[PDB]
Amino acid sequence: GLMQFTLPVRLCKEIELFHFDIGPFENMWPGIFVYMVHRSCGTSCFELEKLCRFIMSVKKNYRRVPYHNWKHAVTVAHCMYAILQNNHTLFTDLERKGLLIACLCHDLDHRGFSNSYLQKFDHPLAALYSTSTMEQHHFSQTVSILQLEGHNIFSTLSSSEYEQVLEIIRKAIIATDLALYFGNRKQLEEMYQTGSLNLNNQSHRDRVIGLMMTACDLCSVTKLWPVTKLTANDIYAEFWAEGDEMKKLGIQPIPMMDRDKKDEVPQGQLGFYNAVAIPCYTTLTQILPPTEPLLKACRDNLSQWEKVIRGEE
Ligand SMILES: Cc1ccc(C)c(C(=O)Nc2ccn3cc(-c4ccccc4)nc3n2)n1
Ligand SMILES: [Mg+2]
Ligand SMILES: [Zn+2]
Is the distance from CB of 126 to CB of 111 less than 8 angstroms?
no
* Number of Cβ within a 10 Å radius of residue 7: 15
- CA–CA separation, 304 and 313 (whole Å): 9
> What is the SS3 assignment for 1?
coil
Yes or no: is domain 28-310 CATH 1.10.1300.10?
A: yes
- For ligand 1, whether the C-beta of 103 sits within 6 Å is no
CA atoms within 13 A of residue 152's CA, in its CB half-sphere: 10
Q: What is the CA radius of gyration of the chain?
A: 19
Report yes or no: 133 and 127 within 8 Å, Cβ to Cβ: no
Nearest in space to 249 (alpha carbons), one of 124, 127, 118, 126: 118
Q: How many CB atoms lie within 10 A of CB 271?
A: 12
What are the distances in angstroms from CA 170 to CA 20, 62, 129, 137?
27, 18, 14, 11
The CA distance from 160 to 117, in Å, is: 38
CA angle 239, 245, 248 (to 5 degrees): 145
User: CA 270 from chain center: how many Å?
Assistant: 21
75 lines ligand 1 (CB under 6 A): no
CB distance 76 to 106 below 8 Å: yes
Q: Work out the burial of residue 52: count CB atoms within 10 Å of its CB; fewer than 13 is exposed, 13-18 middle, 19 or more buried.
A: middle
Q: Where are the domains of the chain?
A: 28-310
d(CA 244, CA 260): 10
- Where in the sequence numbering do the catalytic residues fall? 68
Ligand 2 geometric centre to CA of 170 (Å): 13
Q: What is the SS3 assignment for 168?
A: helix
User: Which residue's CA is minimally distant from atom 4 of ligand 1?
Assistant: 218
Q: Whose CA is nearest to atom 7 of ligand 1?
A: 272
Rounded Cα distance, 99 and 81, in Å? 9
In the chain, the amino acid numbered 20 is: F
Residue 215 near ligand 1, beta carbon < 6 Å: no
Amino acid at site 194? T
Reported resolution, Å: 2.5
